[PDB]
Structure formats: structure tokens, C-alpha cells
């Protein structure tokens, strides 16, 4: 009757909330990884070229290692 139905409806809402939160987390992690992979690759490029003491690359290196 009413109480069993209300319990089932509550459980469904909690489950849907959980799954929406997991979807949001997964998407945020993917976006983060997308940007992180770029910076890591740019870091590797700078490391290939560390010897040539290029002032433009030095600016880029300073950005890579700057902190919030």
C-alpha cells in the first residue's frame, strides 16, 4: 500500500541522485585528464629542449610549474 510505495519511490530517487552524481564525477575526471595530458606532453617537449635555453620555452616552463 501507500507506505511500501513511498519507500520504493524514495529509494529510486536516492538511486537516480547517486547515478547523476557519478556521471558528473566521471565527466569531470575525463575533462581534467584531457587537460592534464596536454600539460604533461608540453612538459615533455620542454624537457627535450631544456638545453637550448630558449626564452619562449622558459616562459612556458614557468607556467607549467606555477602554483595557485
Amino acid at each position: 500500500g501507500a507506505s511500501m510505495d513511498a519507500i520504493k519511490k524514495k529509494m529510486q530517487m536516492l538511486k537516480l541522485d547517486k547515478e547523476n552524481a557519478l556521471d558528473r564525477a566521471e565527466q569531470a575526471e575525463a575533462d581534467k585528464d584531457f587537460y592534464f595530458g596536454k600539460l604533461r606532453n608540453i612538459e615533455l617537449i620542454c624537457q627535450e629542449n631544456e638545453g637550448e635555453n630558449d626564452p619562449v620555452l622558459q616562459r612556458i616552463v614557468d607556467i607549467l610549474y606555477a602554483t595557485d
Binding site: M4, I7, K8, M11, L14, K15, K18
Partner: protein, 67 residues
Amino acid sequence: PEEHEDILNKLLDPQSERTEALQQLRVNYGSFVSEYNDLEEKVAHAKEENLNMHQMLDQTLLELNNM
């Protein structure tokens, strides 16, 4: 009850009354079967409602496991 025992007392020794008394017992046997049958239906109905409630709950708990 108290009436049935008096009929069994009455029937112990001997024509109009003895046949009239057995017809009471013929009615009462079928009448007792009818009343039992009616009650058994009340039991079954109530057990069916109890089972429906448990089955609802059982299934909810199973679904809950997967969430």
C-alpha cells in the same frame, strides 16, 4: 452445543421424534461443513494478503541490493 448433547441423550431409547432429531443432525453436519468452508476462505484471503505484502517487500529488498 448444549443442544447437540441433549439430542444424543434423547436418541438413546425408542418414531416421530427420532426421525425429526436425525434431520436436525443431517442439517447440522452439512451446516458445520458450510461454516468451516466459509471460515477457511477467511483464512486463505488473509494469508493471501500477508503473502502479497511479504512478496512486495522481498522484491524491494532484492532491488535494493543492486542499487
